Design an enzyme around this catalytic site. Structure first.
Site, PDB file in Angstrom:
ATOM      1  N   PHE A   1       4.725   1.313   8.591  1.00 32.72           N
ATOM      2  CA  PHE A   1       4.734   2.232   7.472  1.00 32.72           C
ATOM      3  C   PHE A   1       5.848   3.244   7.618  1.00 32.72           C
ATOM      4  CE2 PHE A   1       2.595   5.789   9.688  1.00 32.72           C
ATOM      5  CZ  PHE A   1       1.925   5.107  10.682  1.00 32.72           C
TER       6      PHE A   1
ATOM      7  N   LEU B   1      -1.844  10.889  13.312  1.00 38.30           N
ATOM      8  CA  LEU B   1      -1.585   9.531  13.759  1.00 38.30           C
ATOM      9  C   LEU B   1      -0.976   9.483  15.152  1.00 38.30           C
ATOM     10  CD1 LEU B   1      -0.239   8.016  10.409  1.00 38.30           C
ATOM     11  CD2 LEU B   1      -2.583   8.061  11.343  1.00 38.30           C
TER      12      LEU B   1
ATOM     13  N   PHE C   1       1.921  10.591   1.424  1.00 36.21           N
ATOM     14  CA  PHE C   1       1.323  10.094   2.660  1.00 36.21           C
ATOM     15  C   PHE C   1       2.264   9.086   3.315  1.00 36.21           C
ATOM     16  CE2 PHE C   1      -2.562   7.653   4.521  1.00 36.21           C
ATOM     17  CZ  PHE C   1      -2.215   8.075   5.781  1.00 36.21           C
TER      18      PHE C   1
ATOM     19  N   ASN D   1      -1.614  -0.824  12.713  1.00 41.27           N
ATOM     20  CA  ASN D   1      -2.379  -1.663  13.631  1.00 41.27           C
ATOM     21  C   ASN D   1      -3.848  -1.617  13.250  1.00 41.27           C
ATOM     22  OD1 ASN D   1      -3.726   0.573  15.206  1.00 41.27           O
ATOM     23  ND2 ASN D   1      -1.603   0.987  15.825  1.00 41.27           N
TER      24      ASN D   1
ATOM     25  N   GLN E   1       3.407   1.448   3.060  1.00 45.10           N
ATOM     26  CA  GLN E   1       3.105   0.468   4.104  1.00 45.10           C
ATOM     27  C   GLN E   1       3.530  -0.917   3.646  1.00 45.10           C
ATOM     28  OE1 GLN E   1      -0.560   0.702   6.325  1.00 45.10           O
ATOM     29  NE2 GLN E   1      -0.668  -1.515   6.642  1.00 45.10           N
TER      30      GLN E   1
ATOM     31  N   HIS F   1      -0.536   5.258  16.579  1.00 43.66           N
ATOM     32  CA  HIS F   1       0.469   4.363  16.032  1.00 43.66           C
ATOM     33  C   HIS F   1       1.776   4.628  16.755  1.00 43.66           C
ATOM     34  CE1 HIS F   1      -2.129   3.174  12.624  1.00 43.66           C
ATOM     35  NE2 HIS F   1      -2.514   4.438  12.627  1.00 43.66           N
TER      36      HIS F   1
ATOM     37  N   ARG G   1       0.847  -1.192   0.000  1.00 42.27           N
ATOM     38  CA  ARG G   1       0.000   0.000   0.000  1.00 42.27           C
ATOM     39  C   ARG G   1       0.880   1.238   0.000  1.00 42.27           C
ATOM     40  NH1 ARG G   1      -3.591   2.981   4.147  1.00 42.27           N
ATOM     41  NH2 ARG G   1      -5.391   3.704   2.917  1.00 42.27           N
TER      42      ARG G   1
END
Length: 164
Positions: A112, A121, A59, A101, A62, A125, A54
């Site tokens: 990531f 985030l 951004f 997660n 991942q 995370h 991903r």
């Protein structure tokens, strides 16, 4: 004293380059040890041969689902998903390494790399490392992603392990 690990990245099987990481074991030892051990493969499983499934430009990238290769799998070295160690470190910009997660205290193997500041985030995370060398290689990886995260070329961890 903080460990350093490297990933050798390939794109549709062709070498792209190396990206190393400093792992903040002084601040998040259980999370850093998980990623270090998966990177060396010393438990008999880990990241070598797995993909970045991903990638969303601007951004993050991942990866780490070495069991189902699509975001639904992965496992820690502890025999089960493990707790959020702490949220001492923040998502402050490109190169941050953080745990993916599925909600509180569900850390496995997925992680990531941030390619921008992702402050929303924070507290969700666990940040546990940061790119040391090879940010340019993560930027080259980013160009193979897309708005919905699908990659246009297979981005694989051809080799990985511990440096120094």
């Amino acid at each position: 004293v903080n460990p350093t690990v490297f990933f050798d990245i390939a794109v549709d099987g062709e070498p792209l380059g190396r990206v190393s990481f400093e792992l903040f074991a002084d601040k998040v030892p259980k999370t850093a040890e998980n990623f270090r051990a998966l990177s060396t493969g010393e438990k008999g499983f880990g990241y070598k041969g797995s993909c970045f499934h991903r990638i969303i430009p601007g951004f993050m990238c991942q990866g780490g689902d070495f069991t189902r290769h699509n975001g639904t799998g992965g496992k820690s070295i502890y025999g089960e998903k493990f707790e959020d160690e702490n949220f001492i470190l923040k998502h402050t910009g490109p190169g941050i390494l953080s745990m993916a997660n599925a909600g509180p205290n569900t850390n496995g193997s997925q992680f990531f790399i941030c390619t921008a500041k992702t402050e929303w985030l924070d507290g969700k995370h666990v940040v546990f490392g940061k790119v040391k060398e090879g940010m340019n290689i993560v930027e080259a990886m980013e160009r193979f992603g897309s708005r919905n995260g699908k990659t246009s070329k297979k981005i694989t961890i051809a080799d990985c392990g511990q440096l120094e």
